[PDB]
Design a protein around this ligand. Structure first.
Ligand code: CU
Ligand code: CU
Ligand code: NA
Ligand code: NA
Ligand code: NA
Ligand code: NA
Lengths: 620, 620
């Protein structure tokens, strides 16, 4: 009955039938995106209408379409033809990945380049990568992928150990034409293998690890109702899944006494970009928008009990559409469980004689995605004390190149002749805030140092200052770790028992933002990544920081265009967009498979409650 | 047989007998510090000599002494009389805490102040706090404590809820004189209780938490030999305990194949300071050096199975001396256990068809201390992949004051009439480095942004730069989060298989450092806390960043004095001192007992290994 329930296989099959009967899903059509639309603001009329948004690609070259369908009423609501030279191309299709390698295998320029290197074309894998927008006028309005080559010595070989540097090709995947093959010179193909399950490389496996057994004899403390509604230790929320964004959290609220208090209306990772910092023309165009260009949800892994998720695990298996509109289940794609989290609070008091210890726990909601060589885990945590935290875990195999003789300022050496170009992994969290309701405001809080003098005669005082962000034009903010800068989202019309506005404080990790020159193509296309914090006024159609159609978009879409409206955000329905990321200079220890590294952010209550919210936790 | 073994009760009893027979431990003497001395550099002669350092206080006013004893040979090695106006007073004695309240209870000025407030002297607890050095000439060379008052309504009441603001007294604890009583005016004593076990405040306890059972059916994966030598998943180390520093880690090494490779010779938290930022004369002198002034090891808690430490726990029970030289065991004072730590590495490869997941674990070594209202947990973590991490956990009850009518720029309001002054909690980690041996150097690594232009035509390149710190005068460094600043400790004479020097990278949290005016007393006494990183040349007697005798020292001791020697640190035996801390603006949620907040740092291998060190981890 909940409007926030997961899409069902029956809903997707109905969408397919509605599109087919409307003439919109002939044999030349492919579904490049399909997802359920959130309820519009103020759905208090109970008039449920399950609507789906669909991007439809045409493999014959006809214009793609954006279509909205009502499953409830069985109708097409709107259907718009897209001019992709203007508004951007549709996301990459999984079926286009194979096209790149197959087309190059018959191109005479590609074969000549491989022949010069004495490489068997049957052993050459081609990584199909998004194209971006650069100097090539012939690419405007065409669907282009760029290919980089790696050698697979045998079917179980890790091709990433054997990059073919000095060679790149561009492919038009609709007309099936190789537009350019660029060969800048022969580099030796690195020869050592990177097969991390080969006993020759691992040595004998350790026999020293004894088992750790995590069980819950009475079952977990959370309940799941309606397929995806979670109640756990006073928290309440709905777990959504979208093929572009992945796990989305809706209606995060906290039961404070007999009052269910909203905190966040919708939380998601709305974009993630991986820009490379190697100026070689072989790779200087390389920037992945895993969310916007590839759709991270559709590559979600099935998670294995005992390996990927350990403990008493509750799974969700979300349903997505394939390219023909058939439902496809991602079995065990989301893991849910609680974890012990050490000491929550502790005091031993000399005067009262009371010794007091309580333990903490967190609720974990997670999924993993794999796009090419990288694997990313997305973890949302809810804690007993009201803290909300996000953590991204990056692992997999680093993207490789040759290591040039005489070194490089932009590439790490991992093995003889084997390099790994510098890059970043940058995320955008979109937080549709609802602190005690929708009238919210953001303040920037800095530490204030004070000079020794009158009123501060011993020179020990320090303070803080808060600046309200009143309009979108002043709401583009940068981190300042040295002044302890944080941001508070408060509700000026809802006060705690001390007559102060209730709030939550955003704590960032203060990692570097986008490093590229501000005049670069990537700085224009990923403008969100150049600043740590943006605040916008809520609008139905302002969903992604990079715009709706990221693939081969020339730039400026998304947040820079939204904030030009200069809307009032002082005590209004607002959205916080937080940029955070990892700057990765690969180390030898990252090879041949990378140990996890992490980045994230958290929000902690700031006078939201009238006292500690965990006084009623028992001693266990 | 190990020279790094814990002090035994028999060793301490022998020290007591040696001091007594030498005439150094008469009835007027008190042991204010006793600890074992580490072996001198190059103990390859096997000639073991267990030596103890002792600070001896005299309650009759005679000069204290610093004494070194050889338990092995049964002799006094040296005994020096201390001039405390010059070099600082001895640490505070536990028995001096009670003296303050007892002396004030008979002082006519104190009783007059309490009478004006209608407070029963039998209900007034006095917090005995260190004095520092300020404007009072009569305090030079005397042992002073300052007292702040709190009301206990009944024996089990939390007195922290009832501060008596506007009143402070200074006490000479040797002559037993109250030197000054300052009364700046009557503030209402806040009336609400803060009794966090009272059902009236907690409400009914939750019944929703189901048990989490963590067991190890085959026992833990680590072994303990010789009382305190740990071997776990290729790590090797010795766990020491000192009454001043607490847990100390010695001889941290990693078994890489058949080679035991040193990483850190000694790791400790060598100082921690808690400066308050309230300019009221009632509290503007308030700065705790928990390590240097109070000795955090002697207030270590006994840790309870299932509450403080959960899982398959191995305990150490260190032995310390009481004030009379008798051995005292801190039962279950150190917890040791391993913990699951999520995914270690994961990749699903499209081309090879191989799906690979491995799980991570960490070894945990921890203790908890309680000094007055605050409780601190100190956690050392070793991870499978070679990462070393430290985390401090701060909890307990915040220090309180009145909340002034009309507000404050330096105090948070927690309850009606109840304030909590702003403060910091700042730690100093002393890391006696030994990356593959003792020839080490430190480099500062910054991200380098590059301008679009020739050689970088698409404006995507970025790089990094490393600056070697060659002399101590240039080795006082500050954080720069915006440029991704880290520090690498490397061994220039030990190279990995790529002919690069092996190293470890220090990742800081980049929190604000000491906020006080640089001309303040606390900035002079806690100079270490004004900068994020210091590097010194190793010397036997340079143990603490604040000097040997911190209590009532006028300033400048420790790191600022050491680095004036301007010694060569480029490929030498060096020590890294890292400052890190929390800036605490108390929130309503911190009351009446504070949920844990954390801060720390970590070190990760940086080309120390020839490839990932966790390829031999099994699938479990
Ligand atoms: Cu990376
Ligand atoms: Cu604090
Ligand atoms: Na355009
Ligand atoms: Na909102
Ligand atoms: Na002095
Ligand atoms: Na050293």
């Amino acid at each position: 009955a909940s409007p926030f329930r997961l899409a069902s296989a029956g809903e997707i099959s109905e969408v397919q039938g509605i599109l087919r009967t409307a003439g919109l899903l002939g044999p030349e059509k492919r579904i490049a995106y399909l997802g359920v639309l959130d309820p519009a603001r103020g759905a208090g009329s109970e008039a449920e209408d399950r609507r789906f948004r669909v991007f439809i690609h045409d493999v014959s070259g006809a214009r793609p379409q954006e279509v909205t369908v009502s499953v409830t009423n069985g109708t097409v609501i709107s259907a718009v033809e897209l001019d992709t030279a203007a508004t951007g191309e549709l996301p990459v299709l999984e079926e286009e990945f194979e096209v790149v390698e197959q087309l190059l295998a018959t191109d005479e320029r590609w074969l000549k380049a491989l022949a010069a290197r004495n490489l068997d074309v049957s052993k050459v894998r081609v990584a199909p990568l998004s194209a971006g927008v650069f100097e090539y006028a012939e690419e405007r309005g065409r669907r282009i992928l760029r290919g980089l080559a790696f050698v697979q010595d045998f079917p179980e070989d890790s091709a990433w150990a054997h990059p073919v540097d000095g060679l790149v090709a561009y492919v038009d995947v609709v007309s099936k034409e190789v537009t350019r093959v660029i060969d800048t010179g022969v580099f030796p193909v690195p020869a050592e293998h990177g097969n991390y399950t080969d006993p020759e490389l691992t040595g004998p496996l350790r026999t020293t690890q004894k088992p750790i057994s995590i069980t819950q004899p009475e079952g977990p403390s959370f309940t799941v109702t309606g397929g995806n509604h979670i109640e756990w230790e006073k928290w309440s929320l709905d777990v959504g899944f979208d093929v572009r964004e992945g796990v989305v959290l809706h209606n995060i609220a906290f039961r404070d006494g007999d009052r269910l208090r909203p905190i966040i209306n919708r939380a998601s990772i709305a974009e993630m970009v991986v820009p490379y910092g190697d100026p070689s023309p072989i790779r200087s165009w390389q920037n992945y928008f895993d969310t916007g260009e590839y759709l991270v949800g559709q590559y979600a892994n099935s998670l294995e009990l005992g390996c990927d998720c350990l403990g008493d695990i509750t799974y969700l298996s979300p349903v997505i559409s394939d390219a023909f509109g058939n439902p496809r289940e991602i079995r065990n794609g989301i893991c849910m469980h609680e974890e012990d989290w050490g000491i929550l609070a502790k005091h031993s008091d000399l005067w009262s004689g009371i010794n007091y210890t309580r333990r903490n726990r967190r609720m974990v909601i997670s999924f993993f995605t794999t796009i090419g060589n990288y694997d990313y885990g997305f973890y949302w945590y809810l804690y007993l004390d009201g803290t909300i935290e996000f953590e991204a875990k990056a692992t997999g195999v680093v993207f490789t190149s040759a290591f040039p003789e005489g070194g490089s300022d932009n590439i790490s050496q991992l093995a003889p002749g084997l390099g790994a170009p510098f890059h970043q992994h940058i995320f955008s969290a979109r937080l549709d805030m609802a602190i005690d309701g929708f009238t919210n405001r953001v303040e920037e809080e800095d530490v204030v140092r004070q000079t020794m003098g009158p009123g501060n005669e011993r020179g020990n005082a320090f303070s803080r200052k808060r600046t309200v962000l009143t309009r979108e034009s002043e709401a583009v903010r940068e981190a300042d770790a040295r002044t302890g800068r944080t941001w508070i989202i408060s509700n000026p019309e809802s006060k705690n028992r001390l007559n102060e506005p209730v709030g939550y404080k955003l704590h960032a990790h203060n990692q570097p933002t986008l490093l590229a020159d501000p005049g670069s193509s990537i700085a224009r296309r990923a403008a969100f990544a150049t600043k740590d914090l943006w605040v916008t006024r809520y609008a139905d159609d302002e969903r992604y920081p990079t715009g709706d159609f990221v693939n081969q978009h020339s730039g400026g879409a998304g947040l820079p265009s939204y904030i030009a409206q200069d809307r009032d955000i002082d005590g209004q329905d607002i959205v916080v967009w937080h940029t955070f990321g990892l700057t990765h200079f690969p180390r030898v220890e990252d090879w041949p498979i990378m140990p996890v590294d992490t980045v994230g952010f958290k929000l902690r209550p700031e006078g939201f409650f009238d006292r500690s919210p965990v006084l009623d936790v028992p001693a266990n």
